[PDB]
Symmetry: D2
């Protein structure tokens, strides 16, 4: 199966798979059953921003999510990602809907990864920044229902022509280039990711959420991973 590390922005509480009884941000290490969560005061129809950070010295995966005019939510988990993920990965965004639904619109996405070796200084890096997405966005691998270019955004899940979100949808976008997160000469490896999103629903109970994830390079959407599985996991184990 794939290997997944993710930060979930989980809009729907599924208490039988360990969700708390409220929308939450969570750190997912090879399971949808988050290793750590924090309450997230999700705002339907507002643009929010998520930040994810990690480095190999501290071995702590941390995330922060906020909206304008509001306090932030944060979660952290101690994990050595070199013991979870392969040396080469892809990075992506995933989202889903089920019988409950929402738009999962990405307005911007940036990522920076650095590997500093013991040669003088000496730095290896990848950075990308999307503030618009066009119809044929050749540096993204789109999976499932994901599309680019409508209002210049990345729509991870299906939206009707009128703009209404659809249920039973899953989609992902992965950056085209593989990312090197460990190398034998590295003395420090780090990454940072940011994305801005708009989750809107006509309903009092939106579902299911958006995640930033890191995977094996050949990761694909698991069968049946609509809804609570966030397009990331094949089951709720």
């Amino acid at each position: 199966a794939d290997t997944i590390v993710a930060v979930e922005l989980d809009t729907y509480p599924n208490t039988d798979i360990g969700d708390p009884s409220y929308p939450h941000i969570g750190i997912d290490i090879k399971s949808v059953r988050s290793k750590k969560t924090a309450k997230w005061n999700m705002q339907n129809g507002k643009v929010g921003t998520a930040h994810i950070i990690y480095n190999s010295v501290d071995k702590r995966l941390s995330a922060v999510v906020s909206y304008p005019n509001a306090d932030s939510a944060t979660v952290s988990y101690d994990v050595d990602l070199d013991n979870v993920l392969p040396e080469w990965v892809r990075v992506g965004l995933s989202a889903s809907t089920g019988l409950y639904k929402e738009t999962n619109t990405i307005l911007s996405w940036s990522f920076t990864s650095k590997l500093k070796s013991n040669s003088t200084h000496e730095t290896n890096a990848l950075h990308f920044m999307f503030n618009q997405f066009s119809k044929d966005q050749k540096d993204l691998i789109l999976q499932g229902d994901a599309t680019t270019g409508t209002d210049g955004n990345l729509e991870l899940t299906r939206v009707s022509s009128n703009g209404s979100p659809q249920g039973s949808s899953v989609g992902r976008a992965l950056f085209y280039a593989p990312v090197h997160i460990w190398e034998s000469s590295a003395v420090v490896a780090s990454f940072e990711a940011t994305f801005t999103f708009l989750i809107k629903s006509p309903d009092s109970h939106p579902a299911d959420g958006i995640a930033f994830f890191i995977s094996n390079i050949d990761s694909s959407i698991p069968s049946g991973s609509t809804g609570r599985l966030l397009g990331l996991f094949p089951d709720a184990n």
Copy 2:
């Protein structure tokens, strides 16, 4: 055929295809017969650095090459690259040898591309930086004789186990992700590239050179493009 824009570091003068009678730096727009050249005081066995810059406002492709302790060489050419290249490209390094030969060793390579739209501000970017190359460098597409990982470098052309360059060799390395160099909302597009290289030969007359190039995404080494064609062109037209 492919579409190629390149900056050549041309170590061998082929006067019947328009080279000046000395090693030179040149700007190549769809032909090995450079549109502009400048004299280049190439130093066998020393590490040099090349810089390439362009933006869509000025429409001027410029390059500078230098060694430590030495003066630089520079060349510029007025060209609207949106009239030459497709909207999506790959970027790469190429080198060749013929009956005359040299090592074509790359010690570092960086690239930055930016597309600024009329949305507030708003910036799209790709950056990469290699200061080492490992054996399985999954974010490079290696073509021909190119290899990575020997002494942590990118060897574009074949080198024997003892370190001696071989003749009749061609190789290229392209960054894995496609690069977006034009978009309909962009108000300014720019790129910059830098690479450090070591060209060494046991011979008084090294050949053939190294180039930084921009191509159609599916570019491959043309048949017969050893030697004076730099792994870039199918003929000398």
Copy 3:
């Protein structure tokens, strides 16, 4: 006197000092009488963005200004800034009003300068980015009527408590650190600046404009440089 290079966003046509008969963007080299202008379809009350670029290989100062949903305006001028400016400079934003007036509100400002030497690679750089300005913004030198922190913005000229712009106002903001734009070992020097602005006026005829400028490090607002002189020049010569 000071030495000034500037890109003006000139909102009021002063035809006796060479302005065209419309709002314009211009390149000013030691004089308010621009060396080059282009028509600028200024939009009262909308947030716009300006970009300024230069490098020492091409010796061309270029600027672009745009609004969302609108075409851009651009201007370029061939000038070797090493023949105009000292080796160390400060960079800043300036604005003014006269008997006609406008707000001169800066929402964001970024700047990057690079000096690449002939040592391997080897790069020297300064970058800053402001997306908010607080009350005590210690890394800006504020001159004249400029203030920071109201609605998190930089107000270059005076605004009343109700938000109404005042006449006969001038103000500037300079980044605190001096900037090195020439060095004897540099093989390429470059800079880029971006700022986002909001010019609003209750009047059909706003005045006077906003400029990005580069000066001697000890530059101060010249006496009498309200209005058409943009806080930059002591006279209209």
Copy 4:
């Protein structure tokens, strides 16, 4: 007195002020008596590199030091720097000698600080990179015996014309602009610093070391802070 946070590269063991009995890297929070140390296999006459990282989510100050061909040393300490340092700081490098001595030569220094607010995204940043230092390096505040420009380097402590280090020397270099490390709207604040150094001594017992430090903006060298006090502290408390 000043407020100092530093990462020390401590070349001389002063066991009565808590140094371990070997050269070490240490985290110093308002005292020379490090809160955490790690063994450092210092190599006389070789160029090394140090990296320092911190963010306000994790509240962990970490450092790594290495040489080419050698293993690294690392140290970390949990500290909320917003409870130690003021909101505005300067950043610097310091070094000293006493009756034992060494050169304290800086070949390169980079720094990046970021403040991400809850406005969309939205980022504030400062970055600088020095890979050479010239005679009149106007963006550095030099204190004590520090000089710039000899062989294009920053010599923090006194070196004779022949290149021999002198005893009883102290010197510092601070970046000219103040740095904003906390702001009330920030959701994440981070910094990273890197420097490359050459510590050489004719002696079997070099002293005293080099530190990267963060201070109140008006920090000056304390009286009597040669030798074991690293130009940072007024006493050994």
